[PDB]
Copies of this chain bind each other. A is one copy, B any other.
Amino acid sequence: PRIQQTLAGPSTELAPDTFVGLATQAYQANGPVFACMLVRQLVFSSVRFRWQRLRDGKPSDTFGSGDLQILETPWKGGTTQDMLSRMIQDADLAGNSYWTIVDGEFVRMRPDWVDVVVEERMVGGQLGWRKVGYLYTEGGRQSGNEPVGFLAEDVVHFAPIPDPLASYRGMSWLTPILREIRADQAMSKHQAKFFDNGATVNLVIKHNPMADPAAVKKWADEVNSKHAGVDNAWKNLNLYPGADAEVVGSNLQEIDFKNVRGGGETRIAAAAGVPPVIVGLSEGLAAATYSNYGQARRRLADGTAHPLWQNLSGCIGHVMPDMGPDVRLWYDADDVPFLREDEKDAADIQKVRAETINTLITAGYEPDSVVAAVNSGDLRLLKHTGLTSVQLLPP
């Protein structure tokens, strides 16, 4: 909701400044948030890029060409992992990521400084806004530096979570859990304040009024001399008449906010979209349980990695040269050690398919009909040649 008009320029949708505040108050000041974002950074930054062929609109075997050399080395002395980490961090903190390619290398673009330029759309009447290009200013708008612009067809824009109230904006998942982050920080502050302003008394001695203060001090010094340290333990305490001694503990069980800290961690993890056990956090429990790590791994992978990877590939592919209407950019995860179980499941499925095809061929069916039926799950496509692999007798 940053639409504004310039008296001598095209309308531009402004950018926010919550990037710096979020980065300084959540990434570098909170434990769970840093852990979840670090897990995301480690996991979703190991894929590669390849062309995938399309036949009749269906994906098929992949191939590689020289035009993907830029993605392998985004700049001098750097790998694709650095790119993926930087864009994941940018999308997590500011909700947007901007990259442009200059002279064969990719230059990172700070999110909060980039502005998006739009223009009116004519049909008559006005129907929304049309995207034209970007405007970048050094050090912010008020810095007075000369801004430099770009074209819409030469800049990558990574916004995985669309802003509902805007046409070309992104949003971060840290916003709806600011209350939880502040609550956790306040709880930690309160628990730490106990060791700075808290008194831990052991014995409370009540003195008879008929006592000289100096004698009281001398008696207290003697008591401290005789009953201090582990050496002077398990002795007997003699009290002069008219005195009283009482034992007082503490309130150590008041700094325990497990039933609320666990809920806060649960909300933070849910916003991050990562199972707590993968992060490692314990939420209301003595410790995290690793008995069901496989299901959590399956959930995390198949519910976060693949959609993010495909969205990222689609966003990146527009800046690359055009192969045509059949070849499209796609990711590859054939040598990642995080999806070995998925690879095994796919291999088992393909083995079962092959065994079914062999069984159908044995019965004497036409091979093309058999493979079509197996690939489409429609038994009506089977066409019988008219011969059987077994001898059929007149009786």
Contact = CB atoms under 8 A, between A and B. Distances in A.
A5 interface: no
A237 interface: yes
A148 interface: yes
B190 A233 contact: yes
Contacts of A258: 259, 263
Contacts of A214: none
A249 B338 CA distance: 49
Contact of A293 (B31, B245, B295, B306): B295
A270 B266 contact: no
Contacts of A164: 19, 23, 27, 89-90, 93
Interface in A353-395: 353-364, 367-368, 371-372, 374-382, 384-395
A386 to B, nearest CB: 7
Contacts of A277: 290
Given A196-B229, A245-B248, A299-B293, A351 B340 contact: no
B28 A175 contact: yes
A228 B195 CA distance: 8
Contact of A241 (B211, B224, B270, B356): B211
B252 A31 contact: no
Q: How many copies does the complex hold?
A: 4
Interface string A317-337: 110000001000000101111
A142 interface: no
B260 A255 contact: yes
Contact of A138 (B45, B125, B261, B279): B125
Which of A171, A234, A253, A348 gathers the greatest number of chain B CB atoms within 10 Å? A234
A344 B344 contact: no
B202 A271 contact: no
Contacts of A224: 199, 236
Interface string A78-95: 110110011001100100
Contacts of A68: 57
Nearest to A63: B56
A102 interface: yes
Contacts of A34: 173, 176, 271
Given A128-B108, A381-B60, A233 B199 contact: yes
Given A29-B176, A125-B145, A266 B288 contact: yes
Interface in A234-248: 234-243, 245-248
A278 interface: yes
Contacts of A281: 266-267, 270
A232 interface: yes
A28 B348 contact: no
Contact of A282 (B209, B262, B375): B262
A387 B243 CA distance: 105
Interface in A99-156: 102, 107-109, 121, 123-128, 131, 136, 138, 145-148, 152-153
A388 B392 contact: yes
B342 A337 contact: yes
B299 A278 contact: yes
19 contacts: A28-B171, A31-B270, A35-B270, A57-B65, A61-B372, A102-B121, A195-B229, A199-B203, A200-B234, A202-B234, A202-B250, A206-B241, A247-B250, A249-B254, A258-B263, A282-B287, A283-B286, A306-B337, A364-B392
